[PDB]
Design a protein around this ligand. Structure first.
Ligand SMILES: *C[C@@H](*)[C@H]1/C(=C/c2[nH]c(/C=C3N=C(/C=C4\NC(=O)C(CC)=C4C)C(C)=C\3CCC(=O)O)c(CCC(=O)O)c2C)NC(=O)[C@@H]1C
Ligand SMILES: *C[C@@H](*)[C@H]1/C(=C/c2[nH]c(/C=C3N=C(/C=C4\NC(=O)C(CC)=C4C)C(C)=C\3CCC(=O)O)c(CCC(=O)O)c2C)NC(=O)[C@@H]1C
Ligand SMILES: *C[C@@H](*)[C@H]1/C(=C/c2[nH]c(/C=C3N=C(/C=C4\NC(=O)C(CC)=C4C)C(C)=C\3CCC(=O)O)c(CCC(=O)O)c2C)NC(=O)[C@@H]1C
Ligand SMILES: *C[C@@H](*)[C@H]1/C(=C/c2[nH]c(/C=C3N=C(/C=C4\NC(=O)C(CC)=C4C)C(C)=C\3CCC(=O)O)c(CCC(=O)O)c2C)NC(=O)[C@@H]1C
Ligand SMILES: *[C@H](C)[C@H]1/C(=C/c2[nH]c(/C=C3N=C(/C=C4\NC(=O)C(CC)=C4C)C(C)=C\3CCC(=O)O)c(CCC(=O)O)c2C)NC(=O)[C@@H]1C
Ligand SMILES: *[C@H](C)[C@H]1/C(=C/c2[nH]c(/C=C3N=C(/C=C4\NC(=O)C(CC)=C4C)C(C)=C\3CCC(=O)O)c(CCC(=O)O)c2C)NC(=O)[C@@H]1C
Ligand SMILES: *[C@H](C)[C@H]1/C(=C/c2[nH]c(/C=C3N=C(/C=C4\NC(=O)C(CC)=C4C)C(C)=C\3CCC(=O)O)c(CCC(=O)O)c2C)NC(=O)[C@@H]1C
Ligand SMILES: *[C@H](C)[C@H]1/C(=C/c2[nH]c(/C=C3N=C(/C=C4\NC(=O)C(CC)=C4C)C(C)=C\3CCC(=O)O)c(CCC(=O)O)c2C)NC(=O)[C@@H]1C
Lengths: 144, 161, 160, 68, 160, 161, 161, 160, 160, 161, 160
């Protein structure tokens, strides 16, 4: 981050070992700086998969998960959803308290491998978060 | 998300132009209707559950959807339907307050049609339910915000259909 | 804007808008015509404000227009004046919007990398912004002058 | 606005993990009030030991300015 | 309170207060004495409002004071009236605060578990609160009546 | 955290009391000085980096701290300390705006003494820097809010000491 | 990804063949040009931000792109473009050191064309900036490694175009 | 190779290459001709190293060529000799590449599951590899012998 | 150092040191005495190098020794010379260590906040570092001069 | 962590001193001892499992520890204990390579005594196993690095005890 | 349709249908249900397809929305989108019919004179149809995707 968002007091709480890596990840998940960038300009089966990719490194498992996380987002908002992912057993066994999450490409969910390959490292983030000025896409050239 | 003011500021920032008489006219036109929007939003927030059960009774229940073989049968699928309905009500309130369907296109309609096709949810039935909620909201709010409430319900219905 | 901020927070918490949000929305819509008057005043006085701010900045910091200066040359000075005009337009946008979202997403985020890549003094640009603040508050009534000065001070603080 | 200061020793008794796992097993960490219940009984379902918990931040009287 | 909400948002974003937050703080401190007057009026008329709210609630739903009703019996009815007085105190607290933070901390979150554990009709409590709002707005000016009714409708929506 | 209004509301809700004349007087006393707090906060926000510079120049730098063997020594330690004083300034501004040191106790003082003892941070030097910042803030804000600013800086210095 | 040595090793392992004279000739060919690559990479790392500055000033800036309505308009989009340029220069340095375009094909060019098409990025402007940084690195590195440095910049430009 | 291991960490932290990395690349590139000459002799002595290594392996533990052994039979023994030739080729790959990336990606990752499914003694395979190390060291100069012995040692360590 | 970096990378995967990450250690210990001789040679001429670098820097950028310059005044210039001596010491530390690692923890991370808070020209400090680089390379053999110039260029890039 | 070179560099950086002859001799000593450490490291890496299979025989197994009621009883506890031997061997190798027990204090010794006390692990048995490993390593490596290898196992045993 | 073409080529020879054409008829009737399902699926998402394909076309070929462009202006762009909707309807008709007989008679033969008289770029129309093909195939299963892509490719080649 180019001297950007970061987390004031969160780096200090990490370095002094007051906070764990999982706790810092949960703090980063629930904030204005994550909500504005990964929750505003998106519909609401897709925020769930972006959140699951960022915190678990994969696509959503099955259609039944877009009942659970969808209802969590609808009723208790973004913070409860971000806490549910962090407190999920899948996060706990794979990462637990003190390892930074990473891309995984799992094998066992029967299609999650190709889903994870597509969602990360095959498709990047479109739809810039701010709605303040669109590109008018009529000037592709820098001739002079 | 963009509101009316943000949309005007967007249309002038893209051209790199200061605000002129036309932009001021649009902003003033939004400004003169602010209080009615607040009152209607408060009314809808206070009567959300009432409008939901009324719309369900008028458009959904007492039919094959609530019977075996229907889509809304079982408490889980009925809960999904009413939770979607509450989503429609709350996001319509947001769009009406902001004076823009940007929230409706952004956080509601994107991919909803394909999602409903994948799950087998009845698009016509949900459109009829949203219309029943539109009629109930128009009855509750009064003449001051009836049309401004109904326009975003119509926007939602046209997005689904 | 204030409407965008309140609605975004309400949607994030998955709830309807609070009474405090409703009251602030009502106050913002009440102050709308006054904000528009301030905006039209600044828009009509855009050239003189930029000119006086430029002269004040050049008196305070002659080094920038010196041989070892970023804005050395007539067209380099013109580019700086265009930047000051851009920030004046952004301040007008923020004043009409009632919050700092337009200024933030248009001209402050990434501006450090802006003036680091271009090697431009950020404190010097802040001084120029203060100069436009003085020139603009010279052309407004006290309440409207304070209202515009709040956004000018926000720009000054953000450019730091 | 309330953060417990807790310390636990969770023994792994199912996999015998082959890499590090010292900080994962013994740790002292601040946990917010809204998640401390789930964290504690997650520890208890892993056969962990809750050695110490502290209130640390909030006041013990509460009932206003607490559930922020 | 509005101060609490603004400070919480500013601390969460790790920044000084925004111009919109400053303007809303200024508006709240301007409206403070009017809020104090409204709260004083409601506190002075606390007993009549509670009694009338209970009477209209009983007229609307006689089943609650029927044999299988939660408030059946003299002391069960007295408990419901005490709950209404409690909600009056919370409404006055919210009106003086300018937001719903203390009200939510004291009497909304967990209230579903309240009336599920006690088997008390939450819609009946909401209807009693509505009649209570009618009685309260009967003793206030139009602007002050609207201001109190905003918090009353907040409580009604909270019990939902 | 709590402000003056929230503290009074807590002290009355613990007793289950409606607001009386004394609580109204306390609320009026807080209300009467709101605007001066706002202007002092605006000045402090506009001059935050300047206050930190003059406080550092007057209390910390040009000493053995900034030399090798000092806590200030190396850019990492120095910038961490200056981020600390920026934290102190911002939370002092929050305390001034809220009219209560509850936020200072909750988010700054809790554990800071033991943390500084473990890290080797000079508490006396931190107190001197905080006092220099308080002096600069009192100079900048003016007579209207000088004592109001100074009380929370002294609160922070007393909590650290 | 793969370098030249690992590429030859894999190309022989697929055939189940021992390293023979031709393969060792390829390996020695990579070994002989070792010095120019590390020196070019060191000078590029030392002059990275200057290279981006001249490349921007020579290929993108002072045009309609930087003016309102363009893709490079606003500080947000300008920071995005300059970060992309720094990214491209860094991965070109990686490819030059590794003697192979596999890393560029994997971690850079994958999906970039479609994503830029979706976001409205000017591909011609991107190619012009890439060629400008190619020119500046060719000037900086000297005669030892300018050609090798230029080949992978040409690879990135050709893959995008 | 050394290139992949010196580039992957740079990509991981996101920076250009550090001078220690560059100079270790210099040592690697300077040793290139001697590495090629080292790898050439092992390819000259390919089918003659494996014959000596097999004899020492079977003399150290003849039970694998016993009727209850995994290598009982002419074709079973030929398969084991082929695996030893495979690992000799992989050692030559590692010697020429300067690191163990090809060796790891071709013949160690999953080798435990390999030999567990085939029920082949991994400790026996380790002694088989060490025999190849001794026979290879017998036909090289001291510095080159130690250089090849490093990679043989790594294979023996990773095999178990 | 190189040893610390290699050990960190090996421990991060929970494995033993591969043959690839032992040749770098051997090359480091081979070049250790040369690095020590280079660092001691630079240490002998620390005063002359610092003085000549300061003179060259002042000739290139006299604005820093101008009234509006950070290093205006005799003591302000002495502080700049002391900073140049500090960075020469850090370069010697990096050269002996073989990896630049200690230099980051000593004087490059947070140095942006260092010089922004003191309002000192970071590009001017970079120019001074280049001046001391020229002075140092004027007193060393070709390979030694190149080896020192690698770390000097790294410090210059870090001051960017 | 820190090796001998980094420790000397830090001990001079705290004083802000250029390196002198006294630190130069210490660095030259490590540079003389460089080859034997690298040569001994590969031997331990190749004989890691064999080394562990003898220390366990001479110190732990065939006793009440492996019987019911013992801490090493059951396959899970045995596997965890032998993984503990692998941890100790690998970090002892790292310490003997880096010429400093800083990494041993950093990543092994902290919290280990209290954790073993909480889990019931016998510290005396662990120390005996570490000493047996030290004996085996000293036998394998030879006279050249025997004492250097042994000092870090002694450090680990003293830290645990 | 397949029925139409089989009947017409049989009537060309003035003889009853051969058994092979009958197997044609059974295959076409068996595939007709899947064809109508695919066409209905494309019909449900007609607006998204045309919108995204038009955006893609304007991205690839911006000269048509340039001042010297046939579709320059908002109404000229709307006419282009209406033409794209026409082609999507024709493709759905072709998919349901199975044979491409309606598409050729409705919107293929004479389209050269179409766009020559209107001065519209036929290659630009081809690019728009290809983008429509991509967006449509994004919403279909693989066999159905190929079945639709064949007709899209006929459109692209027959507008050549
Ligand atoms: C009147 C109700 C109709 C109906 C609906 C129905 N919907 C689903 C499932 C989902 N609906 C949504 C919608 C949203 N979730 C969100 O979070 C948002 C905004 C972000 C929206 C708009 C989604 C995503 C799902 C999938 C996940 C989930 O179930 O929560 C279902 C369930 C289908 C199933 O059983 O798999 C139903 C039944 N059904 C009717 O009969 C009505 C017409
Ligand atoms: C000279 C720069 C040109 C330019 C660029 C531009 N890019 C973006 C946004 C993004 N760029 C990327 C890039 C990548 N993602 C990857 O994974 C990789 C390789 C590892 C790359 C190169 C992505 C994903 C985005 C979108 C998300 C983000 O912004 O980080 C933008 C911003 C556009 C917007 O606001 O939507 C710009 C402007 N623009 C020009 O005009 C230049 C020619
Ligand atoms: C080429 C000289 C440039 C310059 C420098 C300048 N520096 C200061 C003051 C300080 N410099 C330091 C530096 C360091 N502290 C560290 O730990 C390290 C790493 C080893 C360094 C380099 C510090 C701490 C100070 C503060 C004062 C002190 O040392 O006690 C000043 C004085 C600024 C003032 O306001 O007085 C100057 C001028 N100025 C230039 O123009 C050159 C580019
Ligand atoms: C992607 C759009 C391209 C484009 C198109 C364009 N078309 C027109 C005008 C007409 N197009 C038609 C088309 C048809 N009539 C038919 O019967 C069929 C078969 C189903 C087609 C496709 C017609 C009839 C018109 C005339 C107006 C009318 O419909 O009444 C125009 C406007 C030209 C003008 O001079 O106004 C445009 C621009 N232009 C592009 O650049 C795209 C490649
Ligand atoms: C500054 C006036 C003095 C000084 C300070 C110093 N502090 C640290 C490190 C830390 N400081 C903190 C601070 C806080 N904890 C809290 O909860 C808050 C509120 C946000 C504060 C201000 C913490 C947690 C740390 C540890 C983590 C971190 O470094 O961020 C250092 C660095 C010590 C080191 O190098 O390890 C320093 C130097 N030093 C002085 O000389 C001043 C007198
Ligand atoms: C003026 C008081 C200061 C100053 C400025 C300066 N700026 C430039 C060049 C550019 N500035 C911008 C700015 C923006 N683009 C945006 O989108 C926004 C947000 C609205 C801003 C502020 C840009 C894009 C450029 C590049 C040229 C272009 O616009 O196409 C220069 C010229 C630098 C050069 O190398 O020529 C200067 C001098 N200089 C001073 O001395 C003041 C501190
Ligand atoms: C027997 C069919 C096979 C066989 C076995 C064998 N075992 C050992 C040594 C030990 N075995 C154990 C086993 C356990 N400890 C436990 O807690 C459990 C779970 C209940 C088991 C199974 C232990 C602890 C030892 C070590 C000695 C001790 O008990 O103290 C040996 C000796 C190996 C040696 O090197 O001396 C042997 C031979 N061998 C075969 O061939 C059979 C197939
Ligand atoms: C072996 C001779 C003795 C023995 C050991 C024993 N240890 C455990 C469990 C753990 N040991 C560790 C150790 C470490 N983790 C680290 O990161 C490091 C340094 C890098 C060390 C040294 C930890 C954390 C645990 C707990 C988690 C886990 O099990 O992996 C056990 C298991 C105890 C149990 O069943 O809960 C045992 C048996 N036991 C003996 O009898 C020997 C004297």
């Amino acid at each position: 981050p180019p001297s950007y968002l970061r987390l004031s007091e969160a780096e200090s709480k990490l370095k002094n070992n007051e906070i764990s890596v999982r706790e810092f990840v949960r703090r980063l998940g629930r904030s204005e700086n994550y909500r504005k960038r990964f929750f505003e300009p998106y519909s609401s089966p897709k925020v769930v998969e972006l959140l699951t990719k960022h915190f678990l490194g994969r696509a959503p498992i099955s259609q039944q998960e877009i009942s659970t996380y969808v209802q969590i987002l609808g009723t208790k908002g973004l913070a409860a959803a971000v806490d549910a992912i962090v407190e999920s057993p899948e996060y706990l066994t794979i990462f637990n308290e003190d390892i930074v999450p990473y891309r995984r490409y799992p094998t066992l969910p029967a299609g999650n491998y190709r889903a994870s390959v597509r969602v990360n490292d095959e498709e990047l983030i479109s739809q810039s978060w701010s709605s303040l000025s669109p590109t008018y896409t009529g000037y592709q050239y820098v001739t002079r | 998300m963009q509101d009316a003011i943000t949309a005007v500021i967007n249309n002038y920032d893209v051209q790199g132009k200061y605000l002129d008489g036309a932009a001021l006219d649009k902003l003033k036109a939004y400004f003169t209707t602010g209080a009615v929007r607040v009152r209607a939003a408060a009314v809808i927030s206070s009567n959300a559950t009432t409008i939901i059960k009324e719309a369900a009774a008028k458009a959904l229940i007492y039919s094959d959807l609530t019977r075996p073989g229907g889509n809304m049968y079982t408490t889980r699928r009925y809960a999904a339907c009413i939770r979607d309905m509450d989503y429609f009500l709350r996001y319509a309130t947001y769009a009406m307050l902001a004076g823009d369907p940007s929230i409706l296109d952004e956080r509601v309609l994107n991919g909803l049609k394909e999602t409903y096709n994948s799950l087998g949810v009845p698009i016509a039935a949900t459109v009829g339910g949203i219309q029943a909620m539109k009629e109930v909201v128009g009855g509750l709010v009064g003449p001051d915000a009836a049309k401004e409430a109904s326009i975003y319900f119509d926007y939602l219905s046209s997005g689904l259909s | 804007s204030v409407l965008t901020k309140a609605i975004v927070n309400a949607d994030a918490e998955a709830r309807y808008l609070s009474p405090g949000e409703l009251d602030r929305i009502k106050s913002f819509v009440a102050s709308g015509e006054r904000r528009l008057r301030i905006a039209q005043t600044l828009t009509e006085a855009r050239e003189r404000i930029v000119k006086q701010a430029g002269d004040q900045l050049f008196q305070i910091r002659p080094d920038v227009v010196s041989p070892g200066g970023n804005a050395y040359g007539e067209k380099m000075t013109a580019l700086c004046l265009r930047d000051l005009d851009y920030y004046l337009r952004l301040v007008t946008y923020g004043i009409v919007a009632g919050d700092v979202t337009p200024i933030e997403e248009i001209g402050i985020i990434g501006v450090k990398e802006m003036y680091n890549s271009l090697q431009t003094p950020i404190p010097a640009v802040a001084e120029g912004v203060r100069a436009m603040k003085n020139v603009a508050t010279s052309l407004l009534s006290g309440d409207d002058a304070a209202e515009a000065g709040f956004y000018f001070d926000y720009l000054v603080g953000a450019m730091q | 606005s309330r953060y417990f200061k807790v310390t636990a020793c969770i023994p792994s008794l199912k996999r015998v993990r082959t890499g590090r796992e010292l900080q994962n097993t013994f740790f002292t960490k601040l946990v917010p009030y809204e998640n401390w219940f789930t964290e504690q009984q997650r520890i208890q379902k892993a056969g962990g030991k809750v050695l110490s918990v502290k209130l640390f931040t909030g006041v013990q009287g509460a009932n206003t300015g607490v559930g922020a």
